[PDB]
Design a protein around this ligand. Structure first.
Ligand code: HEM
Ligand code: HEM
Ligand SMILES: CN(C)Cc1ccc(OCc2ccc3ccc(N)nc3c2)cc1
Ligand SMILES: CN(C)Cc1ccc(OCc2ccc3ccc(N)nc3c2)cc1
Ligand SMILES: CN(C)Cc1ccc(OCc2ccc3ccc(N)nc3c2)cc1
Ligand SMILES: CN(C)Cc1ccc(OCc2ccc3ccc(N)nc3c2)cc1
Ligand SMILES: [Cl-]
Ligand SMILES: [Cl-]
Lengths: 362, 362
């Protein structure tokens, strides 16, 4: 039964992957040797080539991703050889370093041993390798409320935050066999942060806003040809709106719009003044300015949309069906100013792809 | 066959309508007398009460409408008695007047004779009773490009525009029997227009922007209990983003953002400056300011969203399933700053409702 769903997903993936790689004749035999390995072992192992390309296809099939134009240049790191928690830690540390690249961010994925029996070899608890802690107790809100449950979990395991609004969470993951995860504090020299300043408004620094340079999503499962890589953190660079329009602006996140309106010198009294909209623009301007000023890669939502239009064009030209999630592709500011808003997308799920999986904490 | 689909839609509507009206016991007999009239005549006629309430239910079921909180106060004008084109014209003229109400806009619908055999008694060509003409010929673009095909149609029928960017289209509709529609120029005293000025930036008047006060959508079919009112123009007041973020901003409409950026004194050179986003905010501020300054009703998208949240609450409280089209409910500016963005909606079609129908021109 499980042996079957593995085989069908394998046939579909190998065919498409070898087609794209210009190795269509190699299919027949590779497909045969896989079928054998399935019968014998209950699973099969990807070559470096299959895995690298699979990860790339997976990004290409991510309906919600506006940044897909660069799918083919993803930097794939094959860490299926790790066996220990020191290795997992060091691989994660290394991911941060090479992906950050002094600010010239390389879109990178580190791939760990896949699920065996549906049994995890490694299980990463972090939502992102770099994120800020969050604390809610007795009317006191500190840091990122989205990180509240993970922070409280780390604090059960012996970690303690300094309770600034920007405490870096430790790396926390669990190895197969161990009932409890381990956690490792992050070396500050590895983590680039960007202070938020405004190009025109000097007072903007009084808000003492900052964000981390590299978003490294680490809780999603990569699925390639019937193989489940539940631990495979990947990154791109940020689109400014992620920081300025959501992380810093959402009421249930940092909720800074009222403070932003104050430093930019406008009233936050009437809906008709559109002070929130104005706050959002200046904050988003601020974010872009600050990242560029420091040498940390970032894209604005207009450029991002232009790139994604090219992705649409490149897709049709290659004879590939395009898939997308309109509700996630439009940017949270001025979406009607992008072509994305004015067309529709098929939201079908094609594999290889990245998927949600259940959290171990909570 | 047609007699059947009419009966089932009638049973569903009368039941729900009499339930809401507190007349549940009157159903039995009203339903019986309808069934008779169906057998005898092939159709049935709504009472003033059924029709009024039906129009209200139809608005309430409009998935794409953010303004549904006020569904129950819709002002229904019953003009099923018109037989002539002078009557149709005068009813349309009257709609404009009472709905405008010196700027204190009354949400109004005028209801004309429904389709008989699926045969129209009246067929309105205007998309809205008040709209601006549009001209595209030889690299010259004038007025509203969305009105290009209707403008060219009116010009076939003997109308001629002055070719300003704001020529008011004539009312144009066709009566049953007549092979061709008629057109009637709009009396300027009936049409309120609002010049666009900015509260802070005096130079904004140099753009010589204006818009009409009352959007009166006139090409949709109202369906109430199996009866098709193909001619039933209705109106609300504008949400500012409709004018500032779409009509005036869309490249395929008035396309004013570059001009807006110039008068507000910012460069329109780099995506990272977010000059479009900034332009959009000031233009939208300008629109709201100008409507309020003149005494013409308008709502901003934040207030509109707050009202729609109340509509959600009022719906659940009344034990009614809520339906909505997320992609149309979010406003085209700062959607993530409204609760609408952060939840989902069922997009099922419930009748009574308003529907698209095929255009007679084109
Ligand atoms: C290179 C720069 C990239 C940019 C600018 C970019 C941009 C985005 C943005 C803005 C989102 C929406 C995030 C949200 O609203 O929560 C997104 C979603 C996503 N991106 Fe990308 N992305 C990039 C690279 C990548 C890479 C390298 C991968 C994986 C190999 C990836 C996979 C995804 C996935 C899976 C989602 C959806 C996650 C979900 O459903 O919650 N992206 N992308
Ligand atoms: C009272 C103030 C009202 C406001 C502020 C309002 C707001 C809106 C807005 C902003 C839209 C989206 C328009 C677009 O993006 O193209 C919309 C759609 C709609 N509204 Fe309303 N509305 C109001 C009253 C009404 C009334 C009185 C009716 C009918 C009785 C109505 C029926 C609809 C329908 C049918 C649509 C969807 C049209 C389509 O699918 O293209 N609304 N409304
Ligand atoms: C915690 N999850 C259950 C919710 C969740 C998981 C992954 C998510 O990924 C968003 C995402 C993924 C990849 C990205 C790559 C680059 C970029 N700038 N943003 C990116 C943003 C979002 C929400
Ligand atoms: C694939 N296309 C040819 C068909 C198609 C394209 C865009 C579609 O909708 C995009 C869209 C989404 C939201 C909107 C909200 C308001 C508005 N005026 N237009 C809006 C338009 C629908 C169908
Ligand atoms: C020409 N049609 C095929 C496309 C089309 C038709 C009606 C449409 O109605 C939009 C609409 C409808 C009712 C409204 C009521 C109030 C308001 N402020 N806007 C409103 C906007 C939009 C597009
Ligand atoms: C009905 N809810 C309990 C379930 C539910 C609510 C909102 C949902 O999505 C809203 C939504 C739409 C677009 C988004 C784009 C980006 C982002 N970070 N979140 C976004 C969230 C999905 C499911
Ligand atoms: Cl993030
Ligand atoms: Cl309009």
């Amino acid at each position: 039964e499980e042996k079957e769903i593995l085989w069908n997903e394998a046939k579909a993936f190998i065919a498409a992957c070898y087609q794209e790689l210009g190795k269509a004749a190699e299919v027949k035999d590779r497909l045969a040797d896989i079928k054998s390995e399935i019968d014998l072992t209950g699973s099969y192992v990807h070559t470096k080539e299959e895995l690298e390309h699979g990860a790339k296809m997976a990004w290409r099939n991510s309906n919600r991703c506006i940044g897909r134009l660069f799918w083919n240049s993803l930097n794939v790191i094959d860490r299926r050889d790790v066996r220990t928690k020191e290795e997992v830690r060091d691989a994660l540390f290394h991911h941060i370093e090479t992906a950050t690249n002094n600010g010239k961010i390389r879109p990178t994925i580190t791939i760990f041993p896949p699920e065996e029996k549906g049994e995890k070899q490694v299980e990463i608890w972090n939502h992102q390798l770099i994120r800020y802690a969050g604390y809610e107790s007795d009317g006191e809100r500190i840091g990122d409320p989205a990180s509240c449950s993970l922070t409280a979990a780390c604090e059960e395991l012996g970690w303690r935050g300094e309770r600034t609004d920007f405490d870096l969470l430790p790396l926390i993951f669990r190895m197969k066999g161990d009932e409890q995860p381990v956690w490792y504090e992050l070396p500050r020299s590895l983590v680039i942060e960007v202070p938020i300043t405004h190009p025109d408004i000097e007072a903007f620094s009084d808000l003492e806003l900052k964000w981390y340079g590299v978003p490294i999503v680490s809780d999603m499962k990569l699925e390639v040809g019937g193989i489940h890589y539940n631990a495979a953190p990947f990154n791109g660079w940020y689109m400014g709106t992620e920081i300025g329009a959501r992380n810093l602006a959402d009421e249930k996140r940092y909720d800074k719009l009222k403070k932003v309106a104050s430093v930019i010198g406008i009233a936050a009294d009437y809906n008709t003044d559109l002070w929130k909209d104005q706050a959002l623009v200046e904050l988003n301007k601020a974010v872009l300015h600050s990242y560029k000023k420091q040498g940390v890669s970032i894209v604005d939502h207009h450029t991002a949309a232009s790139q994604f239009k090219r992705f649409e064009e490149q897709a049709e030209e290659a004879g590939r069906k395009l898939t997308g999630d309109w509700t996630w592709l439009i940017p949270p500011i001025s979406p009607a100013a992008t072509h994305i808003f004015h067309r529709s997308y098929d939201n079908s799920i094609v594999k290889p792809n990245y998927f949600y999986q259940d959290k171990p904490y909570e």
